[PDB]
Amino acid sequence: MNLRAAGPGWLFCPADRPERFAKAAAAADVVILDLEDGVAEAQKPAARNALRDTPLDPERTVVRINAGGTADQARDLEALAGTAYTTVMLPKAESAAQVIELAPRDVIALVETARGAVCAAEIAAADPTVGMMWGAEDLIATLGGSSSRRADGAYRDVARHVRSTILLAASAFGRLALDAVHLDILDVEGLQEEARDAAAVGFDVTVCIHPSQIPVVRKAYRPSMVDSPVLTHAETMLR
Amino acid sequence: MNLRAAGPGWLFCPADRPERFAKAAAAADVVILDLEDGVAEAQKPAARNALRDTPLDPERTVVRINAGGTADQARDLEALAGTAYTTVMLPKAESAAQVIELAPRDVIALVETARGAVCAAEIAAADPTVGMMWGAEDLIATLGGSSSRRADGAYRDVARHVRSTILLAASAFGRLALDAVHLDILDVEGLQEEARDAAAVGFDVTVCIHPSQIPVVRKAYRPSMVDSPVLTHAETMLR
Amino acid sequence: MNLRAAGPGWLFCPADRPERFAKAAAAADVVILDLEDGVAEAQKPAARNALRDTPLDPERTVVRINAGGTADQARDLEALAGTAYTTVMLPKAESAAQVIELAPRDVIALVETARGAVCAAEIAAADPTVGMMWGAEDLIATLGGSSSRRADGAYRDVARHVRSTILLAASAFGRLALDAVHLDILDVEGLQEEARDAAAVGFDVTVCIHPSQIPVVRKAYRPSMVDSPVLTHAETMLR
Ligand SMILES: [Mg+2]
Ligand SMILES: [Mg+2]
Ligand SMILES: [Mg+2]
Fold this sequence. Notes:
Three copies of one chain form a homotrimer.
Chain A: E1 9-14, H1 21-27, E2 30-34, H2 44-53, E3 61-64, H3 71-80, E4 87-90, H4 96-100, E5 106-111, H5 114-118, H6 120-125, E6 129-134, H7 136-142, H8 157-172, E7 176-179, H9 188-201, E8 205-208, H10 213-220, H11 228-238
Helix pairs in contact in A: 2-3, 9-10
């Protein structure tokens, strides 16, 4: 896929909501049809049928499958066999081996556990990888913590650390870099601040969970002693 | 040991103060009997005798030995032979080899140097490791610096970086994660802030240097769009 | 070279300005004669001739060459053959191999790309390495970003992350640690804050781009429950 040619507004849509697929595609640059945490355990078989029955443009659609080693991932790959989709998102990505076993698909690795953070470079370097994303909430959950954000709304340090880790690992191997979802949908101010910062440090994408967030992300990724790299910054802004 | 079943308030007690061992055990969840920096060089032989003569519960007691390759560590392991203790804390932990040479003991690696930070994952993965701790002051000292904290009391960035490094490395290999001591004993407000943050990101323990800090830590580790990990956060709080 | 014995004020001087070499040497502790980004592409041959024609003290002078694999670096090493300089600075340093191929010269690796950050420990450990520096602007540029600093002037998180990475990697292998240039020359307050912090965490050097910054750096590297490392901090201050 030419995912880099699409804009920065990517949108999760649970795959057991086929009635919303067309609206998601209309709102977003890329749709992530979700078979993992956005779909209840009992609804995953229905989500797999909808995946086959209600196709979206495979050049602008990614499918988030279930974690490596799970029975659900096996059922997901069987369902995907009857689709035109070529790119999957791997949640709880924790090793190069988990990515490699998804070949010949293209893989966006979603790092959201301590093991994935420790192994981020190996995951990014794996041959099927085309992008890296991070997830603050599963990260904190699997660390045994209870909140990813400080009282003032900023991420706690370990989340900020993993965010930088994933940005560097993705960029070191020429992969797309995707920034974490902003869970507080009505907090447009906070999303605006995060997406502006993400654009400023070189993320390619901010992933959204609600279509109202897509215009905020698209606008944030547009701009408002000098050495050679500072001129590159100015040329990036013009672009 | 079932160190994870004990509470989060761990307390250093210098091993040349056997008159305080019982009070430390009464105040804390786990006692770290210290043969390293809490005991003056000339007092380490006396500390080793006290270690043998005044036993604490080996299921709730860790012994901090001296650094790898030192004559003091050799004397420590000889003294420990005449005790029931099974878990040691290794200061200036800098390689998997330093941990492995302490087998068959269980090892809590205290990372507090640049080399230890760079090798944190290898240290965490070593077979004897059961926990990781970090130390800001020895870290800054061995970097050649002069203070670990900013004017406003927050840790400087390299200390925050190592803290996250150790949390991730410990959690990636299922080890206990221990947060650094708060040296300003009377600064209860600052300890409260740090321990609340440590609990929120998934540290298991905040280590203390004064028994007055234990109630602050124990209280801080108790709690005051929703996806699956956010529900895990709420379940962790209830637990 | 005994670069560690020189003070902390290092100063870039473009090598096509030989009329300024003597003033740079008078102002700074160490001069970095620059064949890379400080010299326009068309002016690099003239800079190489000036490098040979206008010598500075090789015990207090480093030469920044061009990036590995470039034709310019090849021309730089040919020009350096007719000089007494023994230490080079490698920009966009990205692998141990790039450092090793500069043997038998001493190498200060300037890490300023995502790949260099991911490989910082391997770069620091390479046998020719004698120091590590980081560069925020090329880092942000090669990440595809557009600014290294927040609205309040602080570095964005990924720059802070790479700064700590380089400090730890340098110190883990006994290399000099050099902090990034402060591009806002007239912002003496901001330089003072950064250099004080750099000195406090154990950087050896803050690199400057204007001679007016050298006194600020030199002054900042002078100083204005207690365990063993806190006493080391106090002894470092007295020293
Ligand atoms: Mg998740
Ligand atoms: Mg220490
Ligand atoms: Mg540069």
